[PDB]
């Protein structure tokens, strides 16, 4: 089961020029394209090796789409000011995410299109792909305009069509990474805090995709409520890192076990501090 997601951000900045427009594209947890209007030669550009084989008509066409989208989103920022009776002196932000999820057979599971204005929910295409949920009176104005202009049907056509078709293409072209789970490299470190207590830290490094479970047990009792668990973070090389730590009484260290669950591991993994 897989996903393709585009994230567009438009940010006004009065006194500092026209609004900035940034778009990024992901397949699952892998970024594969970007566009930034503040780039020297602003264009859609590759961010994963398996999209680089796309020809110049792909890049020219995507760049065309992004420039037209930037223009429309800038218009939309101005419209939002009217809807909310806001001044042209404030900076504001539109965020939009859209895309498709497919199952293991490649059929469309779900389409997405939802947005925020200044970080608050604005309007979202419903799962039926034919109706909208509007969060406030401003978005209700948009809802009516979009019903009139048959926006949902055209979006539905994209989500059920090109979105799924191109996702399938990407998944095949990048199968050696996108459909190849990379298990974490794991180890446990030990750090005395005093003569009476120590930190045990369980590391999971270089894994893909991001979803993982990292837990400490004491005598086979779960310690999640006593565990410091950091947010999963990008390694910088398209893989991820995470760790979980517990402070333990000196002498109890061999009673603690770290448990790692990940798609790239055939079985639950169990680790201890190896002195």
């Amino acid at each position: 089961s897989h996903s393709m997601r585009y994230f567009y951000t438009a940010m006004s900045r009065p006194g500092r020029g026209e609004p900035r427009f940034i778009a990024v594209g992901y397949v699952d947890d892998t970024q594969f394209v970007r566009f930034d209007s503040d780039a020297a030669s602003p264009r859609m550009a590759p961010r994963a090796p398996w999209i680089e084989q796309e020809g110049p008509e792909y890049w020219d066409g995507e760049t065309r789409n992004m420039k037209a989208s930037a223009q429309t989103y800038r218009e939309n920022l101005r419209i939002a000011l009217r809807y909310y009776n806001q001044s042209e002196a404030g900076s504001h932000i539109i965020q939009v995410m859209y895309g498709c999820d497919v199952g293991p057979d490649g059929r469309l599971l779900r389409g997405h299109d939802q947005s925020a204005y200044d970080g608050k929910d604005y309007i979202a295409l419903n799962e039926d792909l034919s109706s909208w949920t509007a969060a406030d009176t401003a978005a209700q104005i948009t809802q009516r305009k979009w019903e009139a202009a048959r926006v949902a049907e055209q979006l539905r056509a994209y989500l059920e069509g090109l979105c799924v078709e191109w996702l399938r293409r990407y998944l095949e072209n990048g199968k050696e990474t996108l459909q190849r789970a990379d298990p974490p490299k794991t180890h446990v470190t030990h750090h005395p805090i005093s003569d009476h207590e120590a930190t045990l830290r369980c590391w999971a490094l270089g894994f893909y995709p991001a979803e993982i479970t990292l837990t400490w047990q004491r005598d086979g009792e779960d310690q999640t409520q006593d565990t410091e668990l950091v947010e999963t973070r990008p390694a910088g090389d398209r893989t991820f890192q995470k760790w979980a730590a517990v402070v333990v009484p000196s002498g109890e260290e061999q009673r603690y076990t770290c448990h790692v669950q990940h798609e790239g591991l055939p079985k639950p993994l169990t680790l201890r501090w190896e002195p």
Partner: peptide
């Protein structure tokens, strides 16, 4: 591939 619906005003 991004959508070619690029004209939509709110």
């Amino acid at each position: 591939l991004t959508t070619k619906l690029t004209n939509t005003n709110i």
